[PDB]
Amino acid sequence: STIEEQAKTFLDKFNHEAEDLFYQSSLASWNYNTNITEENVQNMNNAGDKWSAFLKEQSTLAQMYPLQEIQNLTVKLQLQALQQNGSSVLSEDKSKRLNTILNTMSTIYSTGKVCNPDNPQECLLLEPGLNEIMANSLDYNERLWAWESWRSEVGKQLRPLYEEYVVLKNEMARANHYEDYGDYWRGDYEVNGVDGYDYSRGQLIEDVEHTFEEIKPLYEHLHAYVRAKLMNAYPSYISPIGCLPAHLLGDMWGRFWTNLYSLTVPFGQKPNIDVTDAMVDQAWDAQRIFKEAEKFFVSVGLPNMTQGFWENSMLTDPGNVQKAVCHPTAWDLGKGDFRILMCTKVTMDDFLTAHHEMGHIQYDMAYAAQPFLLRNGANEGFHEAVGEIMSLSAATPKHLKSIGLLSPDFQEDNETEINFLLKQALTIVGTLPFTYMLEKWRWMVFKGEIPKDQWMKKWWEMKREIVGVVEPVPHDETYCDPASLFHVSNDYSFIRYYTRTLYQFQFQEALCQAAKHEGPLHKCDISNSTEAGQKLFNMLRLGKSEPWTLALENVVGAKNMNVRPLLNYFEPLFTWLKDQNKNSFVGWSTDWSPYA
Amino acid sequence: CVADYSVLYNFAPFFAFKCYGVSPTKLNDLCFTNVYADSFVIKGNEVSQIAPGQTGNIADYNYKLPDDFTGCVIAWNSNKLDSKHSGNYDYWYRLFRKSKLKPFERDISTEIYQAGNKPCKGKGPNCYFPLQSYGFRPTYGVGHQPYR
Ligand SMILES: *[C@@H]1O[C@H](CO)[C@@H](O[C@@H]2O[C@H](CO)[C@@H](O[C@@H]3O[C@H](CO[C@H]4O[C@H](CO)[C@@H](O)[C@H](O)[C@@H]4O)[C@@H](O)[C@H](O[C@H]4O[C@H](CO)[C@@H](O)[C@H](O)[C@@H]4O)[C@@H]3O)[C@H](O)[C@H]2NC(C)=O)[C@H](O)[C@H]1NC(C)=O
Ligand SMILES: *[C@@H]1O[C@H](CO)[C@@H](O[C@@H]2O[C@H](CO)[C@@H](O[C@@H]3O[C@H](CO)[C@@H](O)[C@H](O)[C@@H]3O)[C@H](O)[C@H]2NC(C)=O)[C@H](O)[C@H]1NC(C)=O
Ligand SMILES: *[C@@H]1O[C@H](CO)[C@@H](O[C@@H]2O[C@H](CO)[C@@H](O)[C@H](O)[C@H]2NC(C)=O)[C@H](O)[C@H]1NC(C)=O
Known part of the structure; x- marks a missing residue:
């Protein structure tokens, strides 16, 4: 009679049907992903339509039961999730326009494109031809031209579209309870109710700012090194006291400066840490790249996958007549029908991505x-952190030497450790300030603080100071760099990256502490040690039944993210980093611009 | 009739041959007053629920074994026999029942009763169909496949 048991008697009635409908929708999605045909996408859209409609009735059904008689965390979560994720607050006149703007944003990001300078020949998209030049092709003129051509062909017309989408999404957000659309993305880590684990969405921004301030001392030295190397390579434009031109960051928007790392090489006599050659040497194929990964997972206590998983997993792009997508994606079809769709042929990056996907699959399996409805224990930050830490632990040279990917002759001298630690730093600290700036800027935009005519003004004001990167061309309010992004156009949060950046280091230090491994955080090999694997499996099987802060306290200890694992992980790198950076100007000139 | 249990061994590679009151190896050297055989199909994860004293979803509502049980329980996999891509909805099982079921008794009913407080008198608040089907598919893993 009490609503507490009425909720569960309603739940168990539709739980099986919801599981079946989700399985069918995922089946249609995987079929279209494997089979790129009009009927396959039609089946995707139809199955998604049934699932969304069922969520539409489920929202009202959940709203039927009052939430003031609910005390179980499981029942509370299950009732609340269907209330908002299967309903919308915007009326038809506004919801239809919001959906249309989202579709047009995605289309313009995809269809809208630029190519070779002043040539009506075969063109290429951002990642194939433009972001490829921005990433690896080290050429000032080409990167400088593309950095504005892509935005004038995509972000230019998307700027009014992005503004209208921000207004519409804010209209949707502020209706029920939220204060902005950023409150939606800040709710991925909000914890309330349970004693000893409480959180506020406003305090998350303060935590991100504090982490940015903590990384600032390392990031300014990294900026000094990058500026010195750029001045050595291109003294024509880069000043020894200014910022870093955005095009000279190994990408269009600076996140992973792995090619910029090549110019900023600490030691030219770096030994071989690459096992990509060993893949050919030791006869590595698609199956083995996952087989030794499964062996490593078993050695730490994680059970392997079933043969049915391997008989439904696509480890190699089909090509031929039925083309597919080579993008790494691990698939959980439902009811123990895990799959995968990615590529692993001859490279060490294939090994790392295999560990990434295997960690994700094991986390979902646990x-x-x-x-x-509680299968959402895959906290995006925690999920990506686990995927990254498994590859980080398996990438230690000790594990490769034991398996056979490397040899005992090669040693971890100062050159090697400095080289790979600084290579990882150029991708981690390379993205940390930019990620923080983007998150704060989009939070303020969705809060309405940034004027619609001064988006780029505030963007560059923060870029020159917070990020220490100044635009190589006088970018202005006409274009929109965030609008020309895949995640933004598809309306995807980016706090996931910033959270996982510290979450992975917290997980790594927790694993090394639990296993009592002897060695630094940059050489932590826990292959044959399963002691930390037991606690890792406990956290994996915890699921969405306890707050993530509680799991972090049980494993790491600190409820909030901490930079100290990053600090002592980079300390051997920091020793050499200090020497080569105090010589140059630690600061940067915000007023100075690369375009003279 | 002459009861030969040898034909049962080679019929199928059974993975569960629990025998309670009689050791299986002596089954060929005994005589019984009467023999009863019952057949049904369930999912894998419910296989453990077929035992005396054991309490679960299936035992409490569908098939309850008395404690004084002297027979044998045999279960073998039949995934490839009754797996279809569309969904093997032809098989049905009771999703939930109002009251406990007496051992060695069966209930055939589909009346939509009120599983709440206010009398439903039809489909509505907390009033649901007692029965519920399931779509077995070949791609399913162990635990969601037909078992005889
Ligand atoms: C409320 O309802 C919404 C939908 O209405 C649910 O949102 C979905 O949440 C899931 C779970 O996170 C999302 O699945 C994830 O999507 C990520 C986005 O990737 C996009 O970009 C790549 C290109 O890089 C595309 O290929 C891809 O198709 C997407 O377009 C993925 O990155 C995630 O993959 C990660 O994990 C897998 C392991 O499974 C790894 O293999 C990957 O490498 C990666 O690390 C993941 O697939 C889903 O996209 C969301 N949908 C939408 C529309 O946003 C909420 O979850 C739900 N909330 C509840 C129920 O509480
Ligand atoms: C809050 O909600 C959760 C979710 O339902 C409750 O967990 C439930 O706990 C009971 C008690 O153990 C579980 O019953 C068990 O069933 C198995 C057979 O499935 C049986 O073998 C056990 O002996 C036991 O009876 C129940 O399964 C479990 N729920 C789920 C979905 O697994 C929890 O009890 C609730 N909180 C409170 C305070 O009741
Ligand atoms: C984990 O244990 C296994 C089992 O001994 C190790 O594999 C052997 O390692 C020795 C010495 O490294 C080699 O001589 C053997 O050839 C290896 N066996 C096989 C089948 O390859 C493995 O090296 C250990 N790994 C770690 C990191 O300790």
Whole structure:
């Protein structure tokens, strides 16, 4: 009679049907992903339509039961998730326009494109031809031209579209309870109710700012090194006291400066840490790249996958007549029908991505006993952190030497450790300030603080100071760099990257502490040690039944993210980093611009 | 009739041959007053629920074994026999029942009863169909496949 048991008697009635419908929708999605045909996408859209409609009735059904008689965390979560994720607050006149603007944004990001300078020949998209030049092709003129051509062909017309989408999404957000659309993305880590684990969405921004301030001392030295190397390479434009031109960051928007690392090489006599050659040497194929990964997972206590998984997993791009997508994606079809769709042929990056996907699959497998609506224990930050830490632990040279990917002759001298630690730093600290700036800027935009006519003004004001990167061309309000992004156009959060950046280091230090491994955080090999694997499996099977802060306290200890694992992980790097950076100007000139 | 249990061994590679009151190896050297055989199909994860004293979803509502049980329980996999891509909805099982079921008794009913407080008198608040089907598919893993 009490609503507490009425909620569960309603739940178990539709739980099986919801599981079946989700399985069918995922089946249609995987079919279209494997089979690129009009009927396959039609089946995707139809199955998604049934699932969304069922969520539409489920929202009202959940709203039927009051939430003031609910005390179970499981029942509370299950009832609340369907209330908002299967309903919308915007009326038809506004919801239809919001959906249309989202579709047009995605289309303009995809269809809208630029190519070779002043040539009506065969063209290429951003990642194939433009972001490729921005990433690896080290050429000032080409990168400088593309950095504005892509935005004038995509972000220019998307700027009014992005503004209208921001207004519409804010209209949707502020209606029920939120204060902005950024409150939606800040709710991925909000914790309330349970004693000893409480959080506020406003305090998350303060935590991100504090982490940025903590990384600032390292990031300014990294900026000094990058500016010195750029001045050595291109003294024509880069000043020894200014910022870094955005095009000279190994990408269009600076996140992973791996090619910029090549110019900023600490030691030219770096030994071989590459096992890509060893893949050919030791006869590595698609199956083995996952087989030794499974062996490593078993050695740490994580059970392998079933043969049915391997008989439904696509480890190699089909090509031929039925083309597919080579983008790494691990698939959980439902009811123990895990799949995959990615490529692993001859490279060490294939090995790392295999560990990434295997960690994700094991994490999803662990909480299989949890209820379907509680299968959302895959916290995006925690999920990506686990995927990254598994590859980080398996990438240690000790594990490769033991397996056979490397040899005992090669040693971890100062040159080697400095080289790979600084290579990882150029991708981690390379993206940390930019990620923080983007998150804060989009939060303020969705809050309405940034004027619609001064988006780029505030963007560059923060870029020159917070990021220490100044635009190589006088970019202005006409274009929109964020609008020309895949995640933004598809309306995807980016706080996931910033959270996982510290979450992975917290997980790594927790694993090394639990296993009592002897060695630094940059050489932590826990292959044959499963002691930390037991606690890792406990956290994996916890699922969405306990707050993520509680799991972090049980494993790491600190409820909030901490930079100290990053600090002592980079300390051997920091020793050499200090010497080569105090010589140059630690600061940068915000007023100075690369375009003279 | 002459009861030969040898034909049962080679019929199928059974993975569960629990025998309670009689050791299986002596089954060929005994005589019984009467023999009863019952057949049904369930999912893998419910296989453990077929035992005396054991309490679960299936035992409490569908098939309850008395404690004084002297027979044998045999279960073998039949995934490839009754797996279809569309969904094997032809098989049905009771999703939930109002009251406990007496051992060695069966209930055939589909009346939509009120599983709440206010009398439903039809489909509505907390009033649901007692039965519920399931779509077995060949791509399913162990635990969601037909078992005889
Ligand atoms: C409320 O309802 C919404 C939908 O209405 C749900 O949102 C979905 O949440 C899931 C879970 O996170 C999302 O799945 C994830 O999507 C990520 C986005 O990737 C995009 O970009 C890549 C290109 O890089 C595309 O290929 C891809 O198709 C997407 O367009 C993925 O990156 C995630 O993959 C990660 O994990 C897998 C392991 O499974 C790894 O293999 C990957 O490498 C990667 O690390 C993941 O697939 C889904 O996209 C969301 N949908 C939408 C529309 O946003 C909410 O979850 C739901 N909330 C509840 C129920 O509480
Ligand atoms: C809050 O909600 C959760 C989710 O339902 C409750 O967990 C439930 O706990 C009971 C008690 O153990 C579980 O019953 C068990 O069933 C198995 C057979 O499935 C049986 O073998 C056990 O002996 C036991 O009876 C129940 O399964 C479990 N729910 C789920 C979905 O697994 C929890 O109890 C609730 N909180 C409170 C305070 O009741
Ligand atoms: C984990 O244990 C296994 C089992 O001994 C190790 O594999 C052997 O390692 C020795 C010495 O490194 C080699 O001589 C053997 O050839 C290896 N066996 C096989 C089948 O390759 C493995 O090296 C250990 N790994 C770690 C990191 O300790």
